Amino acid sequence: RPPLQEYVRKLLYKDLSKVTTEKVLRQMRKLPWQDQEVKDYVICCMINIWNVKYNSIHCVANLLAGLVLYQEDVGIHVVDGVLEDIRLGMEVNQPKFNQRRISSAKFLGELYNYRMVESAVIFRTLYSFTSFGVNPDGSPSSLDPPEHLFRIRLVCTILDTCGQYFDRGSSKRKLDCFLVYFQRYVWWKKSLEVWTKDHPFPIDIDYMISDTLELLRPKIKLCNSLEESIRQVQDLEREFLIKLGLVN
Amino acid sequence: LSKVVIRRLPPTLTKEQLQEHLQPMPEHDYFEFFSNDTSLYPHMYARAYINFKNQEDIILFRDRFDGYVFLDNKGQEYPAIVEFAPFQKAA
């Protein structure tokens, strides 16, 4: 394995922690960024964020924020790459990649926290989890078959990472709107014929959703039925219709 | 929104070969090719970003190339996907 590859790998996956961030930054800066193979390798190593311990993922976002002062193109390519990986992960959707896909979602959330992406990128991604390859009547599909509940884990992962910053102003409204759509998505999954008395919907997924939502919105109404969740969506879409002027 | 991605291209397609398929190319600021950078091996695909100058040219471009079938050496089909990039910042 070539020397610069082992060097980059060592800096990002071994040396980098909360206490060495300034030293790793200094070293990354002096890399031969004019060598295209080396620049490509660093980008590729950062997109492959699963190699990094979960609790040090945020250190890679922080390192990238220092680095884009001198090498801005690198940061753009990493963000573009992580978002491509989140999309490809839904197309592939094999359980052996679960840990890697979660690491990518957490990394995107930390990229928002260290100001590498704006909130629009986060909301685009959250809606993609509830709509991409999802039939609009809530029937199962190729990418979202019945016992696949991983979209719910992905959503909760992003919300747990950066959701606390969407509590004032316009981002507050945007999160409130997304949660109305999320609660319907959850009731579509819960309403599938596979779930019975003998084969119940997993209680652990239920608790994941309620813990996430109650942390962000202590007074939120958790819907107790599919009907209630559809009505919330209908009331919200009546508001939209008024704003868009399709009728009035 | 001016930054457009064309993705799920064959993993051994090159920027130049892609250009031969796309021409005549509309006016653009930026046009770069990416591949071999996923965390989900062996699911390998290639892709590109283009930043268009006018808005009407974007609608034309995806009418033409969304679903356009590229081939690799062995004759496997690769329908491309054309959408706005999820991150709009240009390099």
UniProtKB/Swiss-Prot annotation, chain A:
Where does the protein end up? Cytoplasm, Perinuclear region; Cytoplasm
What segment(s) does the record annotate as region Sufficient for interaction with UPF3A and UPF3B? 1-161
Q: Tell me the segments the record calls region Binds to UPF3B.
A: 72-92
Q: Which consequence is recorded for altering D80K?
A: Does not abolish interaction with UPF3B
Expression sites by tissue: Ubiquitous.
Going by the entry's taxonomy, the superkingdom of the source organism is recorded as: Eukaryota
The record places domain MIF4G at: 6-219
User: Subunit details for this protein?
Assistant: Found in a post-splicing messenger ribonucleoprotein (mRNP) complex. Associates with the exon junction complex (EJC). Interacts with SMG1, EST1A, UPF1, UPF3A, UPF3B, EIF4A1 and EIF1.
Its function, per the record, reads: Involved in nonsense-mediated decay (NMD) of mRNAs containing premature stop codons by associating with the nuclear exon junction complex (EJC). Recruited by UPF3B associated with the EJC core at the cytoplasmic side of the nuclear envelope and the subsequent formation of an UPF1-UPF2-UPF3 surveillance complex (including UPF1 bound to release factors at the stalled ribosome) is believed to activate NMD. In cooperation with UPF3B stimulates both ATPase and RNA helicase activities of UPF1. Binds spliced mRNA.
What is the protein named? Regulator of nonsense transcripts 2
User: What is the native source organism of this protein?
Assistant: Homo sapiens (Human)
Q: Which residues of the full protein are shown?
A: 768 to 1015 of 1272
Swiss-Prot record, chain B:
How is expression of this protein distributed across tissues? Answer: Expressed in testis, uterus, prostate, heart, muscle, brain, spinal cord and placenta.
In residue numbers, the region (Binds to UPF2) covers 3-8
Q: Which domain of life is it from?
A: Eukaryota
Q: Where in the cell is it found?
A: Nucleus; Cytoplasm
**Which family does the record assign?**
Belongs to the RENT3 family.
Please tell me the disease that this Swiss-Prot or TrEMBL record associates with the protein: Intellectual developmental disorder, X-linked, syndromic 14: A disorder characterized by significantly below average general intellectual functioning associated with impairments in adaptive behavior and manifested during the developmental period. MRXS14 patients manifest intellectual disability associated with other variable signs such as autistic features, slender build, poor musculature, long, thin face, high-arched palate, high nasal bridge, and pectus deformities.
| Subunit structure as annotated in this protein's UniProt entry | Found in a post-splicing messenger ribonucleoprotein (mRNP) complex. Core component of the mRNA splicing-dependent exon junction complex (EJC); the core complex contains CASC3, EIF4A3, MAGOH or MAGOHB, and RBM8A. The EJC core components EIF4A3 and the MAGOH-RBM8A dimer form a composite binding site for UPF3B which overlaps with the EJC binding site for WIBG. Interacts with EST1A, UPF2 and RBM8A. Interacts with CPSF6. Interacts with DHX34; the interaction is RNA-independent.
Q: What does this protein do?
A: Involved in nonsense-mediated decay (NMD) of mRNAs containing premature stop codons by associating with the nuclear exon junction complex (EJC) and serving as link between the EJC core and NMD machinery. Recruits UPF2 at the cytoplasmic side of the nuclear envelope and the subsequent formation of an UPF1-UPF2-UPF3 surveillance complex (including UPF1 bound to release factors at the stalled ribosome) is believed to activate NMD. In cooperation with UPF2 stimulates both ATPase and RNA helicase activities of UPF1. Binds spliced mRNA upstream of exon-exon junctions.
Protein name, per record: Regulator of nonsense transcripts 3B
Source species of the chain: Homo sapiens
- Gene encoding this chain? UPF3B
In terms of the parent sequence, the fragment covers 50 to 140 of 483
